Enzyme design. Structure first.
Site, short mmCIF file in Angstrom:
data_model
loop_
_atom_site.label_atom_id
_atom_site.label_comp_id
_atom_site.label_asym_id
_atom_site.label_seq_id
_atom_site.Cartn_x
_atom_site.Cartn_y
_atom_site.Cartn_z
N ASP B 13 24.27 -7.14 64.60
CA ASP B 13 24.39 -6.01 65.76
C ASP B 13 23.37 -6.01 66.84
OD1 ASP B 13 26.95 -5.41 64.37
OD2 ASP B 13 25.87 -4.02 62.94
N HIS B 41 31.81 -7.13 68.19
CA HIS B 41 30.73 -7.23 69.56
C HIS B 41 31.30 -6.37 70.70
CE1 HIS B 41 30.06 -11.60 67.56
NE2 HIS B 41 29.71 -10.46 66.79
N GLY B 302 32.56 1.58 61.47
CA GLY B 302 32.47 2.60 62.00
C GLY B 302 31.03 3.31 61.14
N1 LIG Z 1 21.38 0.92 75.37
C1 LIG Z 1 21.71 -0.16 75.14
N2 LIG Z 1 23.06 -0.49 74.25
C2 LIG Z 1 23.19 -1.94 74.42
C3 LIG Z 1 22.44 -2.83 74.99
N3 LIG Z 1 22.81 -3.96 74.83
C4 LIG Z 1 23.96 -3.61 74.14
N4 LIG Z 1 24.35 -2.49 73.86
C5 LIG Z 1 25.16 -1.73 72.98
O1 LIG Z 1 24.53 -2.14 71.74
C6 LIG Z 1 25.69 -2.23 70.70
C7 LIG Z 1 25.51 -3.45 70.04
O2 LIG Z 1 26.14 -3.48 68.88
P1 LIG Z 1 27.22 -4.64 68.54
O3 LIG Z 1 28.17 -4.62 69.75
O4 LIG Z 1 27.78 -4.20 67.22
O5 LIG Z 1 26.31 -5.82 68.50
P2 LIG Z 1 26.55 -7.47 68.58
O6 LIG Z 1 27.57 -7.50 67.38
O7 LIG Z 1 25.50 -8.48 68.48
O8 LIG Z 1 27.35 -7.95 69.76
C8 LIG Z 1 26.82 -2.07 71.63
O9 LIG Z 1 27.05 -0.61 71.53
C9 LIG Z 1 26.62 -2.34 73.16
O10 LIG Z 1 27.51 -1.72 73.96
C10 LIG Z 1 21.03 -2.39 75.72
O11 LIG Z 1 20.40 -3.08 76.02
N5 LIG Z 1 21.01 -1.08 75.84
O1 LIG Z 2 31.24 -10.31 53.79
P1 LIG Z 2 30.97 -9.54 54.77
O2 LIG Z 2 32.34 -8.44 54.74
O3 LIG Z 2 30.74 -10.03 56.06
O4 LIG Z 2 29.68 -8.57 54.50
C1 LIG Z 2 28.68 -8.78 53.84
C2 LIG Z 2 27.31 -8.03 54.42
O5 LIG Z 2 27.32 -8.55 55.78
C3 LIG Z 2 27.38 -7.38 56.52
N1 LIG Z 2 27.79 -7.46 57.65
C4 LIG Z 2 28.94 -8.29 58.21
N2 LIG Z 2 29.23 -8.53 59.47
C5 LIG Z 2 28.31 -7.89 60.27
C6 LIG Z 2 28.16 -7.65 61.35
O6 LIG Z 2 28.77 -8.37 62.51
P2 LIG Z 2 28.10 -8.80 63.99
O7 LIG Z 2 26.91 -8.52 64.17
O8 LIG Z 2 28.68 -10.12 64.55
O9 LIG Z 2 28.90 -7.68 65.11
N3 LIG Z 2 26.98 -6.80 61.81
C7 LIG Z 2 26.40 -6.30 61.09
N4 LIG Z 2 26.32 -6.34 59.72
C8 LIG Z 2 27.37 -7.22 59.33
C9 LIG Z 2 27.99 -6.39 55.83
O10 LIG Z 2 28.03 -5.26 56.28
C10 LIG Z 2 27.47 -6.46 54.40
O11 LIG Z 2 25.96 -6.26 54.54
O1 LIG Z 3 29.43 -4.70 64.49
C1 LIG Z 3 29.84 -5.02 63.49
N1 LIG Z 3 29.29 -4.26 62.45
O2 LIG Z 3 28.29 -3.50 62.55
C2 LIG Z 3 29.86 -4.55 61.05
C3 LIG Z 3 30.41 -3.23 60.44
O3 LIG Z 3 30.91 -2.26 61.10
O4 LIG Z 3 30.51 -3.02 59.25
MG LIG Z 4 28.39 -5.83 66.17
#
Ligand SMILES: Nc1nc2c(ncn2[C@@H]2O[C@H](COP(=O)(O)OP(=O)(O)O)[C@@H](O)[C@H]2O)c(=O)[nH]1
Ligand SMILES: O=P(O)(O)OC[C@H]1O[C@@H](n2cnc3c(OP(=O)(O)O)ncnc32)[C@H](O)[C@@H]1O
Ligand SMILES: O=CN(O)CC(=O)O
Ligand SMILES: [Mg+2]
Ligand SMILES: Nc1nc2c(ncn2[C@@H]2O[C@H](COP(=O)(O)OP(=O)(O)O)[C@@H](O)[C@H]2O)c(=O)[nH]1
Ligand SMILES: O=P(O)(O)OC[C@H]1O[C@@H](n2cnc3c(OP(=O)(O)O)ncnc32)[C@H](O)[C@@H]1O
Ligand SMILES: O=CN(O)CC(=O)O
Ligand SMILES: [Mg+2]
Lengths: 431, 431
Positions: B13, B41, B302
């Site tokens: 994340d 993502h 969530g």
């Molecule tokens: N405020 C802010 N939000 C960002 C920025 N880059 C990404 N986001 C938001 O931060 C979150 C990144 O979480 P996630 O999408 O789960 O990360 P990812 O799995 O690595 O793509 C999402 O809510 C994006 O829309 C940034 O530079 N500033």
């Molecule tokens: O076997 P799993 O169901 O994968 O769970 C094992 C562990 O890994 C965490 N986890 C799995 N995918 C994750 C993800 O995806 P993105 O960054 O790509 O959006 N971002 C954040 N945390 C994540 C789970 O919450 C738990 O701690």
């Molecule tokens: O963005 C993806 N993660 O934070 C996994 C989750 O929602 O459990």
């Molecule tokens: Mg994510």
């Protein structure tokens, strides 16, 4: 390059051991990054033979520090048996070997599971080495498996092992209807060696990052071959780890951008032990000659190895999967005294299409036929030759041909089991 | 470089989605190489939000071909749900997406197992995303799992699925005392989509070898973060795939020597969802502020994300494990309006020793305390700034400091969720 990778470009047993022992002469470290004691690598020095399974191949050079990386599935029992055997032979194993606390442990129940599963498969048995390789990898991936680091607190370990074994014993008796593995028995056996295992732990990834920065020469020892790769091999007739070059980083902690040279060990004809597609397989006299002259018997199960002709189509999949920098052509001497030798340049697909690319999963190989190029053999003995000059033109042609077909230079040629019956045309460490 | 890798340097994340969508503008391909639909993502273009799980992040650029590589565990149901959702929004998914026949399949039983295992762990629940990730990886490694390639013969697939489900159903009812998953039900659901899945199959490794030779720009999209890596993470509180850079080759088939630039996505403060060590974790108002301003809720479950301060000790493990070439500092804007911001420069071990290196397995983190460097915060809004000039000195200092502590340059800075609220100081594709 500083970081050189040595791996089998086929289905294992290409001769990685010999090549690792040989090139390690200038290396600081040697790292195994995948597999377990299913491997069986033969070192032969001045006639004295050593067969390693889990212990890295640089183990005989006191100037090299041997490391069992995190990708390796580690059997404490297996380690102890090889240690005692090498120590009795003057090799102070404990001073030269280090290991990763992240290595999963292979315990007796993994062996019981491997046997059960294998039994359950009936006719469709994978033909595994009977070590608990796959099961140990399942446990790792499920996150229930024990690792070397768990031994750092014996009480908590005892608790963890109880849970896991109860789980597996349930499956062993109720489902497979096999005997249960005794908790206490495994606990005791494992604790007897714990302190020894634990005494060899180093933080491998940090260690390799330091070596890399110092420009230290590092060698990564492969296990199994490319076509046995869990992802890219003839699935499910495979091993449970990635045998391809990406496994180097997953199983050692070294950054992937630090691999300088990937040396792919290439046998000169093919062998496979275990079930699985094998297009160029020979069931005739020449196949028998191959087995015989090349003493093709698994250095671990003693099982006979299926032999066939070199398959440039399969080898080309290995070229791309591993970013080969060069090859080490091994066992040429074995081809001595053959009217002709052939190599597979393409595959005839069951639908009639000609292809120069390999199928993926085992089933997709079902009716593929190999299309060959038949070249003249050579009667001259090439055994122990250390100079290209000493190879006949038929042998050199076969060599140029392979390079032509693959697009990869043959940097080293092996002509016998001894460390010195080889010609290094180009040392990976210098490239 | 031609082949650029984008991955999360923490515990997921960090903001990989946004960064992939942004840099793909010049790319021919985008490849996911590990994980499944556990990822989540968020792409945000001109205010329009897209959350991808299994579908690669280049999916919105018609100039890019999206590829789901062999390292990815693929849920047919999951794919279909995202496809329909994106197609309804004008994104012709089937024209831009390709996949690997080597991808294992996640079926309803994997979800039933993941839930069961999770239940069985009681207090010690990993906190998984409730998708059948681990179980699908177990099956792969055990060599019993089904893969996309198996759909190439529906009769034989039907046979294979029967065997596997009988096996798992036995465990589900007799041992976990959970409901059985219906064979026919899974068979039917899967067959309904088979032809669609199968229609997108390309030989990914050969494809990437061809792109590489043409000098095509390729982007590899990470999933999860470094500390969630099955081998190098805070085991067993991890995901079942290698999230570190070596996974790029194991999960796509591209040779490891072809990675040119590894871009590590770095959040600016830390977040973790799921159980596990988290040294710099904040349970105070600032932690609450972090969650709030940064809308830290898992884009997949969530679930609320635990927040804390940037930990340069953990990030340094990611530097070495992934051979970072540079970082993408994300979510800076979130730090706006903090009197001070701190970063962890070392760890106090429970035995009193000061260390700047991280422990491996989760248990080895048990009493580690973070040692900080407290720097001035900044009241100016840095949101949407696209020029360093527009950042206050406190913000720039924090930036130089991080580079100092890590030894890696921050090549890109993100200041908001929108694709364009970013400053590219150096484009990985040009380096
Ligand atoms: N405020 C802010 N939000 C960002 C920025 N880059 C990404 N986001 C938001 O931060 C979150 C990144 O979480 P996630 O999408 O789960 O990360 P990812 O799995 O690595 O793509 C999402 O809510 C994006 O829309 C940034 O530079 N500033
Ligand atoms: O076997 P799993 O169901 O994968 O769970 C094992 C562990 O890994 C965490 N986890 C799995 N995918 C994750 C993800 O995806 P993105 O960054 O790509 O959006 N971002 C954040 N945390 C994540 C789970 O919450 C738990 O701690
Ligand atoms: O963005 C993806 N993660 O934070 C996994 C989750 O929602 O459990
Ligand atoms: Mg994510
Ligand atoms: N005749 C001959 N034998 C060789 C040569 N190189 C290695 N060997 C032997 O061939 C076998 C290689 O099999 P194995 O040790 O199982 O291969 P590995 O697992 O890759 O190390 C052993 O018997 C070696 O001693 C060579 O060039 N010529
Ligand atoms: O789960 P496993 O027990 O590993 O078995 C799966 C398959 O892999 C084969 N096999 C495993 N290790 C091998 C090896 O090691 P070295 O080259 O390192 O000496 N050489 C040759 N074949 C090998 C098995 O025989 C079976 O076909
Ligand atoms: O050298 C090792 N192999 O041939 C494995 C085996 O003996 O089964
Ligand atoms: Mg062998």
């Amino acid at each position: 390059g500083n970081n050189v990778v040595v791996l089998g470009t086929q289905w294992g047993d290409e001769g990685q051991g010999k090549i690792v022992d040989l090139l390690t002469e200038r290396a600081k470290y040697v790292v195994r990054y995948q597999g377990g004691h299913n491997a069986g690598h033969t070192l032969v020095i001045n006639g004295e033979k050593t067969v390693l399974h889990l212990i890295p191949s640089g183990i005989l050079r006191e100037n090299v520090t041997s490391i069992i990386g995190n990708g390796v599935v580690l059997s404490p029992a297996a380690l102890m048996k090889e240690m005692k055997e090498l120590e009795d032979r003057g090799i102070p194993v404990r001073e030269r070997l280090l290991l990763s606390e992240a290595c999963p442990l292979i315990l007796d129940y993994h062996v019981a599971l491997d046997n059960a599963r294998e039994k359950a498969r009936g006719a469709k048995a994978i033909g595994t080495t009977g070590r608990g390789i796959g099961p140990a990898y399942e446990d790792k991936v499920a996150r229930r498996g024990l690792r070397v680091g768990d031994l750092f607190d014996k009480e908590t370990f005892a608790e963890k092992l109880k849970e896991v074994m109860e789980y597996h014993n349930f499956q062993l008796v109720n489902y497979y209807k096999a005997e249960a593995v005794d908790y206490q028995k495994v606990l005791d056996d494992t604790m007897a060696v714990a302190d020894i295992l634990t005494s060899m732990v180093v933080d491998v990834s940090d260690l390799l990052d330091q070596a890399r920065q110092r420009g230290d020469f590092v060698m990564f020892e492969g296990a199994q071959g490319t076509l046995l790769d869990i992802d890219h091999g003839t699935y499910p007739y495979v091993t449970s780890s990635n045998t391809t070059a990406g496994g180097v980083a997953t199983g050692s902690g070294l950054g992937p951008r630090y691999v300088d040279y990937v040396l792919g060990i290439l046998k000169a004809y093919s062998t496979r032990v275990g079930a699985g597609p094998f297009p160029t397989e020979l069931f005739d006299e020449t196949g028998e000659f191959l087995c015989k002259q090349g003493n093709e018997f698994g250095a671990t199960t003693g099982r006979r190895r299926r032999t066939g002709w070199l398959d440039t189509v399969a080898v080309r999949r290995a070229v791309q999967l591993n970013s080969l920098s060069g090859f080490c052509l091994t066992k040429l001497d074995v081809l001595d005294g053959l009217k002709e030798v052939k190599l597979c340049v393409a595959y005839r697909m069951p639908d009639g299409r000609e292809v120069t690319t390999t199928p993926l999963a085992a089933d997709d190989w079902k009716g593929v036929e190999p299309i060959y190029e038949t070249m003249p053999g050579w009667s001259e003995s090439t055994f122990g030759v250390k100079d290209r000059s000493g190879l006949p033109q038929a042998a050199l042609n076969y060599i140029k041909r392979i390079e032509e077909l693959t697009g990869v230079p043959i940097d080293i040629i092996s002509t016998g089991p001894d460390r010195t019956e080889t010609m290094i045309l180009r040392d990976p460490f210098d490239a």
